[PDB]
Amino acid sequence: MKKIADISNLNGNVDVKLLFNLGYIGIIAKASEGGTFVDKYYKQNYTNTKAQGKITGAYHFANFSTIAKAQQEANFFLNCIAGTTPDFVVLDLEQQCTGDITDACLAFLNIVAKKFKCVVYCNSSFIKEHLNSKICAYPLWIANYGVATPAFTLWTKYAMWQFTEKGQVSGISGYIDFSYITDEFIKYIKGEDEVENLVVYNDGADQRAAEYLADRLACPTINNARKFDYSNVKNVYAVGGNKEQYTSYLTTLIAGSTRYTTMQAVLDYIKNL
Amino acid sequence: MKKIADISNLNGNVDVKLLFNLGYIGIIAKASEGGTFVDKYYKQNYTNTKAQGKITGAYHFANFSTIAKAQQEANFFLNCIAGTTPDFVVLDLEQQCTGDITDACLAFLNIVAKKFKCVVYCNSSFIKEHLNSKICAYPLWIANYGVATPAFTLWTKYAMWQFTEKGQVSGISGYIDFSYITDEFIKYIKGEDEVENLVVYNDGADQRAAEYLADRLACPTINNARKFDYSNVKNVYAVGGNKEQYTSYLTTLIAGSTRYTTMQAVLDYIKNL
Amino acid sequence: MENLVVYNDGADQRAAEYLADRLACPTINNARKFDYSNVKNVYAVGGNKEQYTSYLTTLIAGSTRYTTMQAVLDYIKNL
Amino acid sequence: MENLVVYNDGADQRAAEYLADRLACPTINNARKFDYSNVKNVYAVGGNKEQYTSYLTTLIAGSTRYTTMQAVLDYIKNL
User: Is B211's Cβ below 8 Å from some Cβ in C?
Assistant: First the structure.
């Protein structure tokens, strides 16, 4: 799994190339805290990361319990990152609060998500004490230190997992946090859509044969009558019929002269896989 | 194709065994004409035919144009055949009338059909001049003399075809009419239900395999979850699964350990047919 | 057989299967050459009456695949 | 992929296919081990949310196969 670092004003002036030398694919930088705290290193952290072609993130350190306050913080975070275009942004939740703050969190996110892909960062216990599954509309950046594998509730999958808050590199002040970042999340923030396998069929008997192939490939099927954009599919399989019936993106055709030999061809293709 | 004879008072006292010797499987006898004409040989014609174990029919020679009149004739025909239980009965349509008498015919039939399986008898030209496709709710006994194969409109199939009105047997007065009678009609008037082939499957992949078998057998499929009476099906095929899942009437099971070998077994069975 | 449901290849088969579940009966593909003479009720789903056996008892059909399905659910409801 | 419809084996597949026709998209059998992370809208048809990928966007389902189908036609109508 790839890794990403996060930094803030506590780290001072950072040569981000030290981190890129260590293999980190980007930098998530603190932009703001609460309603008025401006991170005075954010701009240069974003700038030097984006300039070098690496992944950028911006995080806001929340201090809200109420909807109103969440909205003020959301507008303030956007004001702090204006003039920068991070790949994604992060609502960092660790504030002292009571009870379930999920609606306030959604109020923040509703504002920010119109401009940036948002992620929610928190630890396992914060989730249990203060959130409900409505939060799961956004991906999770789980902070879980000391564990071999992260454990959390509400979400079933993480986008990033912050595994230490005690990273250290000579020439960078303070501690740096490090995170694993999934290939699914990297695709998401890059706009990368590619579906691996799709099986196409026409109405009738060939649909039977197509489903067997799709079971083997563990993929979807699609009726050829459906107007669909196949430009992003890597392997487009068709079952039955002629090439001329199908998308210009077609790359495998399994077809016989009867419904029965088409089925036999599909079973033969499945065996040879 | 089997044959059946029809007779009336014009034939006098008939030794029906003369006709059974010639191969005729039954006798359709005239019971009545119009609103008041009683065929005085009907009772003995029905009696001697039924006594000998042969097929019986009773026909009424219509003389109606109106609904009211049709109802009077219907009640009169039932009164004439009371004390007899013919296998089926016949509305014989040859009367002089104008226009479309279909509704009057249905009025007759509505009454008689509550007691007996009814058939409509007429020639090609009567159909064109006086009927509409509503009549096709009842089977057709087509009178078409001199032709190698009958031709008619509205209906697509006949139950019986009267091919001559000039039959003659020494010892029977007058002419006798002869008809072909189809195996489908004979089944119908005997209450014989038997379906030849049915393929059963359970929800999922095995349904795909079942449809291929049913295409080959040219028959229906049925989902095994459906509570159904299989007692009348001659060959009950099942695809996938274990014998214990299916009706006690099951006689062929094609099944493998996976969805794919079940499909291969079905294709192998289809080839070996 | 008391009931049978006929469909043509394609979307109407979906609707025919819901009707057959409710009638607890078989379905048959219209392309199959079959003797319908000993079926009491022959239902067809989708399309037009001329595409089907002369033995057809009831045709349930709308002008799109969607209204055909609606008509089959409405038939089921009123049964 | 913008839209995908998931079904479990059986009657719900019928309903899922009408929805996929209207969305002009693929369907996938829930038994298939698949990566849903790059699908914008993941519709499920029939059953309960816990049977499906955590990536589920919308579940359309009633308490019988028939009301599941009705709910899918109603979703289609209001679209």
Answer: yes
